[PDB]
Design a protein around this ligand. Structure first.
Ligand SMILES: O=C1N[C@]2(CCOc3ccc(Cl)cc32)C(=O)N1c1cncc2ccccc12
Ligand SMILES: O=C1N[C@]2(CCOc3ccc(Cl)cc32)C(=O)N1c1cncc2ccccc12
Lengths: 301, 305
């Protein structure tokens, strides 16, 4: 019993964190096999703030301009290439701590653990969701660029995010491990803004099923709803539309608890109308949307 | 910017998790140097757990009755002893992954990271607090016994908790690494209840400072209070008393934000008597009490391990 925001154990990722330095800029890199991955903005100077030409800056670099440090050992860069917004530094040594890994691009609503690093050294681990507006609400300070988001499946690390920047609202933007940004963001200091954020409806429903599995039922009602009626109510509270895919995904939790998805949707509609009235659900006065249907099942079973 | 419930990196602890089996019971063990630490209830049967004589059960065991597995390698148990509610299995091999470590007993209000394990394999890491009623609001299923709580100070792991059981309210109970339970609990299947919980006041204040550091100031007011007047109000809302030690500990956050501790106390006082009024603080409609003053400083300054 009990429900917590839980991150994956970070050991397999800690053994991959290195420090990458280009001139005055120092950030984090991910050392897997003989390649160190890091945000390409490590090659930018003060003059390259608004409109950097990364191809032009990278062509002016030599291998010895990249100072890579793994612990107290300096690694030797023997090659460099750019793939979208990530820089790939070929090094003369394969990381002995390289776990079984994959690079996965995630969709909004998906969750992952973030290993926050500064100077190639891990300082903390926390859980995150990719917001519907493609930003993450992380906890990052200057120097955290190159920190990665991941999930572990058995003994395999699926790397899904690399931190790149902070938007003016304090939210964060980054890329997958292939350098493709999540969202309409670019690695430039030009005017950028996160779009209006919305609540991840399928995750709120999964969290309501987690609360039922943990013995909380106060919020349940004798009602059901159509999918369309639920969505019409949901849109009014800045909730993401709930699709037939989401309904299907909630199937196992619906079967385990005996509460049909559209039945749980009617509880959610009521909660949005009434609020909580001084009550909490899993020790929370707000509807939690950073637990996926998959997270609920693995934590509760 | 940003404030998250953040645990210490768990790598140094993952390299210590092993599986301990004694008969039908399989749980987790902490392998440090040539000793595997685990709950003493691993030696228990069905009628035993109702009223167990652990000295009598342990004396009937031989070293080969304990199957210790570190990954896919079986460790050889060459000795066994009991220290309070913890079993210590001497093994023939020192853990090469043994980090710099200490065993520390923590006080209520102090926070720590939990590495939840099943069958000697880490599955999750989460941050939590030792409640004033000596329980932890953890997330544990059957098989998680022997999972450990820890902090990291510089490059030294301080082990502070070992999970033993779940109380009827879904809250959790355990011991320090010397086997002494936190709270008035016993490691026996019997009638035990968590006492009424209270809010960790110094941690709520530390979290209000974190919110100010992140640009959330709506709750701030012109008022200040005496420590006497605040503690009278606090007791009324089941909040822990705030001591002069707590005031001194909040000093650095008070200096960084320009909000005196007793000034932040008058904000907490108003928050308790009036509520949030539909507003949130750091994306929360409740006053968070699981971030200590040190946790706030560590996260809002970026200390590494
Ligand atoms: O390290 C960087 N460089 C920045 C600064 C300039 O604007 C840009 C524009 C594009 C790019 Cl890719 C990076 C950057 C950035 O946001 N971050 C930071 C990342 N995350 C959190 C931050 C918290 C405070 C301060 C800076 C943080
Ligand atoms: O594995 C055990 N055995 C228990 C069961 C009997 O009562 C006691 C009394 C003392 C001791 Cl040391 C252990 C135990 C216990 O609570 N846990 C569990 C630990 N934590 C969470 C649990 C979630 C569900 C189920 C069992 C969980």
């Amino acid at each position: 019993s009990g429900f917590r925001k839980m991150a994956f154990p970070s050991g397999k990722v800690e053994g991959c964190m290195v420090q990458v330095t280009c001139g005055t800029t120092t950030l984090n890199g991910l050392w897997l096999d003989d390649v160190v991955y890091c945000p390409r903005h490590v090659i930018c100077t003060s003059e390259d703030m608004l409109n950097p030409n990364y191809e032009d800056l990278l062509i002016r670099k030599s291998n010895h301009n990249f100072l890579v440090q793994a612990g107290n050992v300096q690694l030797r860069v023997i090659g460099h290439s750019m793939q979208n917004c990530v820089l790939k530094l070929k090094v003369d040594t394969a990381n002995p701590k390289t776990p079984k890994y994959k690079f996965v691009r995630i969709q909004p609503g998906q969750t992952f653990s973030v290993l926050a690093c500064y100077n190639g050294s891990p300082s903390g681990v926390y859980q995150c969701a990719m917001r519907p507006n493609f930003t993450i609400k992380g906890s990052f300070l200057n120097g955290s660029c190159g920190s990665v988001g991941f999930n572990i499946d058995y003994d395999c690390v699926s790397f899904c995010y690399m931190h790149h920047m902070e938007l003016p609202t304090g939210v964060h933007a980054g890329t997958d491990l292939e350098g493709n940004f999540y969202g309409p963001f670019v690695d430039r200091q030009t005017a950028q803004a996160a779009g209006t954020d919305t609540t991840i409806t399928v995750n709120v429903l999964a969290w309501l099923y987690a609360a039922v599995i943990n013995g909380d039922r106060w919020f349940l009602n004798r009602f059901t709803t159509t999918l369309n009626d639920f969505n019409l109510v949901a849109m009014k509270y800045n909730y993401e539309p709930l699709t037939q895919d989401h309904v299907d995904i909630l199937g196992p939790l619906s079967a385990q608890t005996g509460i049909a998805v559209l039945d749980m949707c009617a509880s959610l509609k009521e909660l949005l109308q009434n609020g909580m009235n001084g009550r909490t659900i899993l020790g929370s006065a707000l509807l939690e949307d950073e637990f996926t249907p998959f997270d609920v099942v693995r934590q509760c079973s």
